[PDB]
Structure formats: structure tokens, C-alpha cells
Design a protein around this nucleic acid. Structure first.
Ligand SMILES: [Mg+2]
Ligand SMILES: [Mg+2]
Lengths: 144, 134, 192, 683, 134
DNA sequence: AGACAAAACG
RNA sequence: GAGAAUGUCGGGGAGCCGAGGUUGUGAAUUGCUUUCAAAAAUUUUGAAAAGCAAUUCACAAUAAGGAUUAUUCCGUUGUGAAAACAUUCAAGGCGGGGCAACUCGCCUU
DNA sequence: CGTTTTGTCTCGGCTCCCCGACATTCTC
């Protein structure tokens, strides 16, 4: 009587659009994986678990690799120690604390890359992080 | 009041139309949802594929049809072989007929419908053969 | 400063800050594109692999082994364009809806398919912005036009549009405009 | 250029290229045209070709020239001026084209004249059409296109109406031509289906002699609520309906232990159904059943064109001219005469023997086709084209689970009965957290802190767990945690003990636990052992998916104990519950259906575990629903019962027998002819 | 690690001594207590009574002995006919072989041993036929 | 808001 | 009644994108419970492990699943037994458009 | 076991096709 998405077809289309966005994000990630592997940027432990022959760029079945966490004999260790130490130095200068999660180093590298050299694995981490968050954009544009 | 089973010949006479009266009689039985033994089903499949050469697809579809709506298959009883050996000493029939009777009795079937089994004969005081077409 | 360093400094000041979903939810893609362009440009000055034309060609073939046209087009670009423009920030355009446009009620076409049948293809309607449709509509309006006098409400027409010259004049006047109104049309004939 | 290149970079490149090919300075040109507003999306009735053809005829003066008229139109012009005879030219033409004596008269022609001249049809004359059998109707149904009407609801209603009309035609007239002498329609927003259905159905009741011409056949007689209600009141069908629905109202009286649901009246000397004012929000005596639709159909079918004319134009301007219709149709103006002597008796006897037929949607898996772009190698060349996906790829036609995903936990301090698991999900901390709810948090330190805070707030969650209260608690978490520090609290994992299944089996999907989606318990299996006792089960949608993928039946034919499957029930299925004394083992004989038998027909509504809820087939809306406060309802808390509504109150699943009904509500039971045909089709 | 079933031909080659090597191979299989389908048992009984004319008593006794000590009969699955119809569309074999494969798969059998079934062929990605005598 | 699916309560 | 044109209000379908939430992996910090495992006066303090979490960050999945390597996808819609379909669907040619892929029109069967 | 109570994924932008209802002018 009033009308509120009262249609099975509309709901199906909504689900389909969600799935399509997800699939295209995955495709972008896989293409990044392939390009970086050819460029020889990915860390060896990370690259080892990604298929590059049949299921291109995809993770090998029953694996959840992390670019920065290396698993040696069941123990996970952070990959970028010196960058973490630099971030801790900056935090100490800011006078806050000296105990922070390792993964915060991504933002310190993002700041540092603007005017300093960073390791290639760090660049790959940064690029995938950018792929994760793309931002708002309108196709037409037409600056008002 | 009395569990009733059937043999292959009943369903064959149903499937055959050369003999209108006998086909009618057999179809009349089937209106009562009579029980049946899986070996009857398998033998029916064989005869269908050999004498009538009907397609495998059609025979399977009709088997499913009948087993779903008309008749009721009887679960195979694990004591069929031992009982059949028990029946063989006192009874001299075809081992196939003996197996059919063994499974029918093991499922408490009270009446078996068939022609080529010496009608009226009682098997171990538990199941009397009935010849319906007479 | 770029979004990355903004987040970094907000994190330095308040180590308890929620970033995802609280500090920056959604912002114009221009911020991300500018930050990534700056980062890639700066790093291209240090890592030789970003300057190896062989590696650029290798990546292009990897992605576009079967599209020689796009390979050739990309061969004139660099890793910066490949990373931002083609891979990360590539947004597909809308699908064409022209196939769903209605069909003409008058003109058909007939053709015989591989099945030995003879079936009809339809002609799509004309976009109303088309000059042809504009002319058609303008002629229709001209023909339907007819004037009346306020005082006695009589069909005063046939005295101002009676010869083909009058109709040619009206059509010439209408073409030059984009819209007509009571005052313009009445003033045309000198009427008020 | 403006219309086809709808893209910024493309548009500017096209602009610059155009400015180069034509010797125009590309300095102010692009500035002028870089901000051209895009054309609005709208299209005309005709294509470009038709407009090009029609313009030459419409133009006049210097813009008009004879040579601009195509060959066929010029031939037609020559024929018309000549006045000769052509089969493609009608008499109405020469009537209209009397003035077009000379070729020069073919100037400034309006749309209709030029249209006819170019194509030879005086606009759209329609085809009227006439169906000669049910084959035409079924072809119409087959070629119907989806999304072709206002909304899915009207489309579904119209399509089902057409299917029902076809079934009636086949059953009662063998689909023979002009079997239906006349068709009447009524609706009682919904107006949309008023005209489309009449237009479609005119093809069945039309006359080809030329008398019946128009948008709708003269035999289609739409009615109005006035005629229907006045016939019903005058004809006493209201009395029949009241008698039919009364027993529900005495049942409600017994249930309430009162007498406010039935009112004595002395003018008729009987009880009439009624509702107390408090339960009179939107009550309507008609909508609480499904048979009033049929009653209205019956009322409409006997209303002749005279009745509709009389009650739509009762204004006569003179008593005499409409006195004839009064006498022919009204007893002496007091009441209308019955269509025949025993109409009330026939209507009662038919209404009491109407089985409601319910459409069912049991789609689970359906084949799907996938075409994707891909480079194919043909004739030594790689070309992009659409390749079809190989293998069998099914599409699941139901939601497999609810959206919320919970994690599995093991709390030593809670007892887990065998066959059940604990699943915890995050929830926001708000005023809805009382001690009972606070007892369902997995973390014990959080339980301690929350209990302390709530106690400090007089044990009032509304005050304790308001946003201000939560902020204060986060500020001073020390005071409620024995002084030991603690991270702020914003969300807490609440656990529930139940039967939740994993979402999948690959990756981390094994760590996701979900509940069956709404309306997916579509199958309810009933087995029987050799002894006779019945076993009941509810098959999960997933198991049904694998079983149907393997080509097997949805419900297993045997349970773990080996009990044979008696049958499976699904929502909207119809079952018969025999009387307590009745022994329905090989009954059949589903043709002698009297009011008593039909009164014992129930419809499945929902299923869970071994529980199957039923509602009598003729019930549409409850007299009163259930409210947690008053705690009364026509069918208790669930608005549906596991047992019969009659005083015997027997378990339906214990003795019910499934039945099969067609679109017209006729039961189907195996018969001699049926069995014969079963393998006659194979013979 | 993999459920193993057999067909009639294995037990026949065991019963036949004309071919010492093949009889040996078949007996070697039987040392592993392989599973088997009741239809295999019935077909074995028929072939025994037709080709070899052996007595009903002796055949029944040997059936009981083998089913008791060597092999393991597989309970008939009520979904045999529907699955067989499902298999028929994708597979073109004798309906008897299709029934045998249907029951074997329905019992989670991972390997079926037989000759006249186009060895090495996989049935619905669940059971690979193995030809042992090669 | 509605009504299913199942926990929860006796 | 039908047709053409121009406006107002609604409805339907499809498409390109965005931000969270949930579950799980790893980490930083702080807790609750149990057991070990000591010191001390049944009770108090300390190390370790396990269960449950909290705050924050990186990452994985997001209908089970099935394709594919195109900058492609199918999976909650309808019909109904064919487990088959609808929702893409011919050929040419003459042009417009672009860094080109690709896109928009015209003409004849 | 029989009955009642309870919880159930949520929000943003923009474009391009179609249909219908109601008005106005004109024609058949
Ligand atoms: Mg026999
Ligand atoms: Mg064989």
C-alpha cells in the first residue's frame, strides 16, 4: 500500500550487486598479487602460498597467509622490525607510550614513503592496503 | 487383518494387455496397495529388459512410479538365506521362489499372490498362496 | 597533508583512536589517488625494478597476454599508471541500456535465419533530442495551432495563416527559437 | 557527437577532433561545448526511418518538394489523384482525400493523413481477436513475459486467474469453442486488474458477427459493490454466511467463558456473530474465511446486465420507463427475485463443500546458465566471445541461512545437554541488559563488573546502561573491578545454547554458525514402523539440497530406526484428520465428500523439530489474534494449533492422511483408471 | 582408508579353477574381507544354478558360509532406484551394473572390483572401478 | 511491523 | 474509442560504486575462572598453561558452492518435468567517436 | 512433552531503460 522494496526480484538484485562488488575486489587483489610477484616484491614466505600457475594469484587451498607475519615452527614473528622501532621512536618523541600493536607500522610507513625509501615488501603491503579502501567516486564527475 | 504380498507375475499381467481380463484382475489387486519384495522388483526389471526390450530409462521411471504410489517395497531381511535353507529341506521349489517366500514370510506376509507356485499350498504354517486369476 | 599521515598523527596524539569506521569512513577517491601517486613517484626514485622496461613489459604480458591492443596502449605508460589507473582505481562504466529501448510501431525488417525461417527485426525509436523528431514535433504543433479573439471568441484564424507564405514565415520564426509562449506568438503576427 | 560520446575524456577528444577536421579554431569552440548539458533520456513513438518518410508529406512551401517522397508513397499519391482502384486503399481514404485532387494538394498534411498515405492504415485499428479453444489461452500463457505489468502482485493474480479459467474451461466444456456464454468480473490501487483482465478475457466470449466491437466484449459485465451487497442482503446469502461462521463464534465464547462473541436477536430469533468493542479494531465478518471469495463470485455470476444497468443508472427520469426492470427484477421495490427457487439452498450446499486450493512454492534447486566473456581460438585467430559454463551448475532458490554469524564457545560453568552447542555473538551494551541477560555473557570479568555497576545504580539497567551511564562506567572502570584496571567496554559476547550448523566446510567457514532462514523448513517427514507407531522429523534445507542434487527424493524414505516413510508434509499441504472412531487405513473413496468430511481438512502452516502446526483449510483470519497481555487467541499463542479445534483435540500428525487437490479444489485419489494409465503411458 | 566392494565375476573366478592364476587372484581379494552388495549375491546364486547346475542345498550352504566368514553383505539402500535413474542419464551401462554401482556408492564404497565395466572409469566422482586381474 | 524457528519455561 | 504531441505524479527492472557490522587468524595491553606450581598465614602473594573476553590495529571469509584468466562471471526472480527454459542472441555494408580496446547511429535481407 | 517468548544485517551516491494515471491541444 505504501511501498518498501516489496519485491523478491529487487532483493535478489541487491544480493547480486553485493556479490559483484566483492568479486571485483578479489580480482583486483589477485592482479596485484601477480604483478608484485613478477616484480619480485612479495616476501618469500607470503609468495610461497599463492598459486601462480593454475589459480592465478589466489591463495593455496586451506591457507590464510599474512604478508607481514612469518610462521616458523608454529611461532608468528613480525617482518618489519626496524620500521617498528622507528615508529616506537616517534611515539616516544610524542611522549605517549612504548607498547603498541605491530600492525600500526603500516601508517608510519605510509607517512615515511612520501619522502624516504622503504623496503619493497613494505611497498607491497602499502599497495594492498590501498586496494582495500578505494573511497567514494561518481562516474560522471561534472565538477559543479 | 492379513498382510498381502505379490509376485512378479501379477505386475507382468498388469503390464500385459493381450489378456484384458487377467490384466484387469491384476490391476484390481494393485488398488489395495499390496506389499511386495525387492526381489520381485529386480526380477520385474530383468523380465522387462529382456522380453520387452523396454528402455532402461522408462523401466526405471515406471519402477519408481509404482514403488512411490501403488505398492510398498519390503525391506530385505538379513535372515533370508538361513530361512531359505530351512525351507529347502521341507520344500522343493525354484530357489528364486523359495527366496521370495522366505522374504515374504520373514516380513509377516499372510497371503502371497502367484500362479506358478502350486496354489493353495501353505508354507510353514505362516503364509497361504492365493491364485487370484481363477 | 595526505590521509595516511593525518591518520598517523591522530594516532600519535590519541593512541586509543578508532580509525576504521570512526575517524575516516568515506572520502573522495582523489585523496587516496593523490597519496598513492605521491608514494609511487617517490619510491620510483629508489627501486630500480620500477624503472626496468623489461619488467613493465613482463607485467603487461602477464595481465594482457591475449589483448595485444591494450598491451600496446599500456606500453606507452609506466608502473605508476599501471598501479593506480589500471589495477587499483579502475572503475567500469555503466552497461549500455540502448538494447532495452522501445521499438517503432511502423517500420520493421524481415530476414531469414539459419533455421530456414523468416523472422522480423525491429527498429528502435528515435531519441526525442534528434533534429528530425524536433522538426516533426514543430510541424505538428504548427498545424494544430489556431487563434481566437478574446472579445467574441471566434475562429479568427484563416486570416493570418492562410497562404503557404504565412506557414513558411511561422516555421522560420519557430526554428530560430528553443521555446515559444503566448506573448511571443501573438507578437509575431503583431497581435497582442 | 553530443549524444553518442557520453564521457568526459572521450567527449573532449571528439570535440577537439571535430574542431580540427572542420577548419574551426579550437579555442572558444570547446569552451562553448565542453559544458553542454547532456540530452534528457526520452524517445519518440516512431523511429528515424518513419519520421524521414512522414516529413516530406508534412512539409509545405519551399521546404516541400515532390521528389522527396519515396517511391511507394509517390505511387500511392498517383493512385489517389487518379482515383483508380487498389486493394491497399480503403473507401474511407477517398472519402477523406476528396480534396487531394492534384499532386500539389499533397502539402502540409497532418499526422493522420501522412501516416495513412505512407503506410496505408488509419492509425491503430486493433485486431479484436477471438480464441476458439483452450489452446489459444495456453499459448497466451506460455508466451507471457515477466515484469510486463505494474507490479509482481497483480501479475501473479492475473496469471493465476488465467490458469484457473483454462482449468474450468477444460473441465466443464472440454475447451470447446464458445462454451462460456458470459463472464462477469469484480474486484472489491487494485483497479489496475479491472481493465486488463476484461480485455484479455474478451477473446473468449466475443462474437465475430460484427455486433460486438470495441475494447471489451459486450458480454463482459463488470459489477459494483452496490449490486453485490444488495443482492446478498436481499437474497439472504448474508444469513447463510452468518450461519456458516457462527460455530467459530460459539467456540470463541467457550474459550473466553463469556457470551459477548454472540448476540441473540429476536427479529430473526437466533444468535448472530459479534465481537466486543475492545476486539473491534478492524474486525470484518467476511475476511475471516476463504469461501467469501466464492460467495462473491456466485453473487456476481447471477447478476445479469439488467441488474447492473438498473443499479448503476437507477435514476430513471420517469417511474414508467424503469418500472419494467423493477417488475422483472424486484418483488413488489422491496427485494429482488431469486435466480431460481432453490438458490439459497444450492448456495449453502455448494459453499459448505468448497476445498480451498493453495498455491505452493517448493523450489530448492534449479538449473542456471552462465555465459562469460573469453578469448576463443577460431580459424587461427583469438576473438572475444561468450562461452557457456560447462558441467551441472545448480542455483539455490531459497536463503540457506540467516545473516547473523555466531562463534562457538565452551564455557565450563554451563551444562551442555548432548546434541546442543553454545554459540556466542557480539552485542551492544544497552538498557536491555538486566541480571538475567547479564548472566548470558561468556566473559566472567565482564559479568562481575556489570553486576557491580548495576548494583551501584540501584539495580536499574535503564539508568546504569544508558549512554551517559556507559560513558561514566568506562571513565571509572576501576571502582567496579576491585580497583584492577580494565579496557573500556562497548560490546560484549552473549552466548546461546542451541542447534546451529556451520555455514560451510572450507577455510574459516567452518567457524561460522547460523540458524535456518525464515520459511525454509519446507519438508516434514512422517515414517511408520512395522508396529504402527509414527515417527516425525524435520529435514534441514541443506540435506534436501544434496538429496535433490543427487537426483533423490527430498525426504529420505527410511529413518535411522528403519521405519518406512509414510509421507512428507510441506506448508499449504492439505491433510484429512479422520474421526476418533474412523479407521482410515485404506479408505480412499474421496468422492463422497460431505460437510462433515470437509470440516476435518487442515492445512500445514509451519514446522520445527517434530512439531507441525495446522490451521483448518477454510480459515483465513482469526477472530482475535494472541496478545501477551490478555493471553487469548482463536488458536492460542502460535495463532495455529498442533491439534484439531474440535472438542476431541487430537494430535493431527498421529492420524492425518495427506490429500492432493487441483487448482479447482477437486481431490485426487488413485483409482482403477489411474493405475491402469500409470503404465499405460509407458506401454 | 577406502571401502572396497566386489562384483559377481570376482567370486565366479574364485569358484572356477580352469584358470589357476585368476582364481588365485580372486581368492587373494577375498582374504581382505571385501564388502559386497546383495544383488551380487543373488546374481551369483542365479549363475551358480544355471551355468553350473549345482544343487540348491549346496549353493545355499556356500552362500551362508561366505557371507558368514569371508565377505560382508551390504544392506540394500532404499535410494537405489532414484540414484540409478540419476546415473542413467550420465552413464550408459547395463541396468544391472548401474544398480550394482548405485548400491555400492550409496554405501560409501570407494573401490569396485570388476572386469566388464570399462575399468578405470570413475562413477560420479565417488567410486573408481579397479580391474585386479590385469 | 510480521510471522517463522527455536530457545526457554513450565 | 484509437492515435500524435506537451507537462504533472507514481510504479518496475537493470547497471557502476561506497561505509560499517559479524565470524576467524596474528599481535599490544588488562582482566575473570580452573589447574599446575611454589612462598607465606582453610586463607594470602608469585610463575606457567588452558577456557572466556575487553580496547586497538593488519589480514581472511561474507549466502554452501561452481566456472574462468576476460581488467568475465553464475548462485534468494518466474514457468514447470523436458532438471528443460525465460531474463544475452543473425547477416552484411556506410559512417561518428576516440591513445586504441570498445562505444553510438544509418542502410538491404 | 506442551506452551509461550524471543530474535530476525544495516546504511549511502548516481544513471538508464520501461509502464501507467491524470491533464492540454489536434486528428479520425
Ligand atoms: Mg519366479
Ligand atoms: Mg553384471
Amino acid at each position: 500500500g505504501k511501498g518498501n522494496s516489496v519485491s523478491q526480484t529487487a532483493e535478489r538484485t541487491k544480493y547480486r550487486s553485493v556479490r559483484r562488488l566483492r568479486e571485483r575486489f578479489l580480482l583486483r587483489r589477485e592482479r596485484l598479487h601477480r604483478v608484485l610477484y613478477i616484480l619480485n616484491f612479495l616476501p618469500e614466505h607470503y609468495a610461497s602460498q599463492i598459486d601462480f600457475e593454475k589459480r592465478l594469484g589466489k591463495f593455496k587451498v586451506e591457507t590464510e597467509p599474512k604478508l607481514v607475519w612469518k610462521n616458523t615452527d608454529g611461532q608468528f614473528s613480525f617482518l618489519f622490525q626496524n620500521s617498528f622501532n622507528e615508529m616506537l621512536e616517534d611515539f616516544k618523541a610524542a611522549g605517549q607510550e612504548l607498547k603498541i600493536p605491530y600492525d600500526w607500522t603500516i601508517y608510519h610507513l605510509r607517512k615515511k614513503a612520501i619522502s624516504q625509501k622503504i623496503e619493497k615488501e613494505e611497498l607491497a603491503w602499502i599497495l594492498l592496503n590501498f586496494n582495500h579502501k578505494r573511497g567514494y567516486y561518481q562516474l560522471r564527475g561534472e565538477d559543479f | 487383518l492379513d498382510k498381502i504380498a505379490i509376485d512378479t507375475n501379477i505386475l507382468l499381467y498388469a503390464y500385459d494387455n493381450r489378456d484384458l481380463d487377467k490384466q484387469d484382475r491384476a490391476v484390481e489387486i494393485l488398488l489395495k496397495k499390496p506389499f511386495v519384495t525387492q526381489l520381485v522388483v529386480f526380477e520385474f526389471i530383468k523380465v522387462l529388459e529382456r522380453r520387452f526390450k523396454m528402455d532402461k530409462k522408462e523401466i526405471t521411471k515406471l519402477t519408481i512410479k509404482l514403488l512411490k504410489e501403488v505398492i510398498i517395497p519390503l525391506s530385505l531381511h538379513r535372515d533370508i538365506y538361513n530361512y531359505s535353507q530351512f525351507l529347502l529341506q521341507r520344500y522343493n521349489f525354484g530357489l528364486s521362489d523359495i527366496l521370495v517366500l522366505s522374504d515374504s514370510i520373514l516380513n509377516n506376509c499372510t497371503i502371497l499372490l502367484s500362479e506358478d507356485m502350486c496354489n493353495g499350498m501353505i508354507v510353514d504354517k505362516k503364509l497361504k498362496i492365493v491364485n487370484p486369476f481363477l | 597533508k595526505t590521509v595516511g599521515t593525518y591518520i598517523y598523527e591522530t594516532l600519535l596524539q590519541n593512541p586509543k583512536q578508532k580509525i576504521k569506521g570512526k575517524l575516516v569512513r568515506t572520502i573522495e577517491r582523489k585523496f587516496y589517488k593523490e597519496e598513492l601517486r605521491q608514494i609511487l613517484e617517490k619510491q620510483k626514485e629508489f627501486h630500480q625494478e620500477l624503472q626496468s622496461d623489461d619488467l613493465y613489459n613482463d607485467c603487461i604480458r602477464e595481465l594482457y597476454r591475449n589483448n595485444e591492443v591494450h598491451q600496446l596502449t599500456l606500453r606507452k605508460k609506466d608502473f605508476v599508471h599501471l598501479f593506480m589507473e589500471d589495477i587499483i582505481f579502475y572503475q567500469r562504466p555503466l552497461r549500455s541500456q540502448k538494447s532495452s529501448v522501445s521499438n517503432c510501431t511502423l517500420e520493421f525488417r524481415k530476414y531469414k535465419g539459419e533455421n530456414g525461417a523468416e523472422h522480423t527485426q525491429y527498429l528502435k525509436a528515435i531519441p526525442k533530442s534528434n533534429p528530425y523528431y524536433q522538426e516533426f514535433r514543430l510541424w505538428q504543433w504548427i498545424f494544430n495551432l489556431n487563434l481566437y479573439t478574446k472579445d467574441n471568441d471566434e475562429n479568427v484564424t484563416k486570416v493570418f495563416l492562410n497562404t503557404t507564405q504565412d506557414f513558411e514565415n511561422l516555421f522560420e520564426f519557430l526554428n530560430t527559437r528553443k521555446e515559444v509562449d503566448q506573448k511571443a506568438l501573438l507578437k509575431h503576427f503583431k497581435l497582442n | 557527437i553530443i549524444y553518442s560520446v557520453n564521457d568526459k575524456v572521450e567527449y573532449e577528444k571528439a570535440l577537439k577532433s571535430f574542431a580540427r577536421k572542420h577548419h574551426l579554431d579550437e579555442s572558444s569552440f570547446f569552451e562553448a561545448f565542453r559544458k553542454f548539458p547532456p540530452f534528457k533520456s526520452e524517445y519518440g513513438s516512431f523511429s528515424e526511418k518513419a519520421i524521414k518518410k512522414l516529413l516530406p508529406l508534412m512539409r509545405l512551401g519551399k521546404y516541400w518538394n515532390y521528389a522527396e517522397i519515396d517511391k511507394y508513397s509517390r505511387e500511392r499519391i498517383q493512385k489517389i489523384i487518379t482515383g483508380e482502384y487498389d486493394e491497399n486503399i480503403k473507401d474511407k481514404v477517398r472519402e477523406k482525400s476528396v480534396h487531394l485532387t492534384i499532386e500539389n494538394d499533397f502539402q502540409g498534411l497532418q499526422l493522420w493523413l501522412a501516416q495513412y498515405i505512407v503506410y496505408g492504415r488509419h492509425s491503430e485499428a486493433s485486431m479484436i481477436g477471438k480464441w476458439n479453444s483452450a489452446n489459444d489461452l495456453e499459448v497466451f500463457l506460455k508466451d507471457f513475459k515477466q515484469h510486463s505489468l505494474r507490479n509482481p502482485i497483480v501479475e501473479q493474480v492475473i496469471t493465476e486467474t488465467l490458469r484457473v479459467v483454462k482449468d474450468i474451461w477444460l473441465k466443464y466444456g472440454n475447451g470447446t469453442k464458445d462454451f462460456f456464454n458470459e463472464i462477469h468480473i469484480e474486484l472489491g490501487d487494485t483497479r489496475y486488474i479491472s481493465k486488463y483482465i476484461s480485455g484479455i478475457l474478451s477473446n473468449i466470449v466475443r462474437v465475430e458477427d460484427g455486433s460486438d466491437e470495441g475494447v471489451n466484449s459486450k458480454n463482459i459485465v463488470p459489477g459494483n459493490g452496490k449490486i453485490t451487497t444488495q443482492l446478498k442482503q436481499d437474497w439472504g446469502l448474508n444469513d447463510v454466511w452468518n450461519d456458516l461462521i457462527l460455530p467459530r463464534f460459539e467456540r470463541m465464547n467457550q474459550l473466553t467463558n463469556s457470551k459477548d462473541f454472540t448476540a441473540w436477536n429476536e427479529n430473526h430469533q437466533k444468535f448472530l456473530p459479534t465481537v466486543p468493542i475492545e476486539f473491534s479494531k478492524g474486525f470484518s465478518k467476511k475476511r475471516i474465511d476463504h469461501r467469501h471469495h466464492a460467495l462473491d463470485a456466485l453473487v456476481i455470476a447471477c447478476a445479469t446486465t439488467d441488474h447492473v444497468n438498473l443499479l448503476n443508472n437507477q435514476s430513471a427520469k420517469s417511474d414508467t420507463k424503469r418500472y419494467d426492470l423493477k417488475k422483472k427484477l424486484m418483488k413488489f421495490p422491496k427485494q429482488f427475485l431469486k435466480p431460481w427457487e432453490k438458490f439459497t439452498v444450492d448456495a449453502k450446499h455448494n459453499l459448505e463443500s468448497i476445498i480451498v486450493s493453495f498455491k505452493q512454492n517448493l523450489r530448492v534447486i534449479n538449473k542456471a546458465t552462465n555465459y562469460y566473456e573469453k578469448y576463443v581460438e577460431k580459424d587461427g585467430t583469438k576473438n572475444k566471445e561468450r562461452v557457456e559454463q560447462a558441467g551441472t551448475n545448480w542455483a539455490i532458490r531459497k536463503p540457506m541461512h540467516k545473516d547473523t554469524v555466531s562463534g562457538k564457545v565452551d564455557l565450563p560453568w554451563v551444562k551442555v545437554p548432548k546434541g546442543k552447542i553454545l554459540t556466542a555473538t557480539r552485542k551492544s551494551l544497552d538498557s536491555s541488559f538486566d541480571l538475567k541477560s547479564i548472566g548470558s555473557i561468556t566473559d566472567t570479568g565482564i559479568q562481575k563488573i556489570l553486576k557491580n555497576y548495576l548494583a551501584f545504580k540501584d539495580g536499574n539497567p535503564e539508568l546504569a546502561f544508558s549512554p551517559e551511564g556507559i560513558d561514566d562506567l568506562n571513565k571509572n572502570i576501576e571502582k567496579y573491578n576491585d580497583g584492577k584496571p580494565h579496557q573500556p567496554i562497548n560490546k560484549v559476547r552473549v552466548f546461546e545454547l542451541g542447534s546451529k550448523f556451520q555455514v560451510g566446510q572450507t577455510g574459516n567457514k567452518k567457524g561460522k554458525y547460523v540458524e535456518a532462514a525464515k520459511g525454509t523448513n519446507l519438508f516434514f517427514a512422517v515414517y511408520e514402523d512395522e508396529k504402527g507407531k509414527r515417527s516425525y522429523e524435520t529435514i534441514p534445507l541443506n540435506e534436501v539440497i544434496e538429496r535433490q542434487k543427487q537426483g533423490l527424493t527430498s525426504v529420505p524414505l527410511e529413518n535411522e530406526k528403519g521405519s518406512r516413510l509414510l509421507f512428507d508434509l510441506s506448508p499449504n499441504d492439505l491433510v484429512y484428520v479422520p474421526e476418533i472412531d474412523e479407521n482410515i487405513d485404506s479408505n480412499f473413496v474421496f468422492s463422497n465428500l460431505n460437510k462433515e468430511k470437509i470440516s476435518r481438512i487442515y492445512k500445514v502452516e509451519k514446522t520445527s523439530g517434530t512439531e507441525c502446526y495446522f490451521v483448518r483449510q477454510d480459515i483465513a483470519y482469526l477472530i482475535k489474534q494472541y496478545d501477551a497481555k490478555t493471553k487469548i487467541g482463536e488458536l492460542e499463542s502460535q495463532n495455529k494449533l498442533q491439534v484439531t479445534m474440535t472438542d476431541d483435540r487430537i494430535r493431527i500428525t498421529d492420524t492425518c492422511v495427506k490429500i492432493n487437490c487441483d487448482r479447482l479444489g477437486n481431490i485426487n485419489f488413485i483409482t482403477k483408471e489411474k493405475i491402469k494409465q500409470i503404465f499405460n503411458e509407458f506401454r
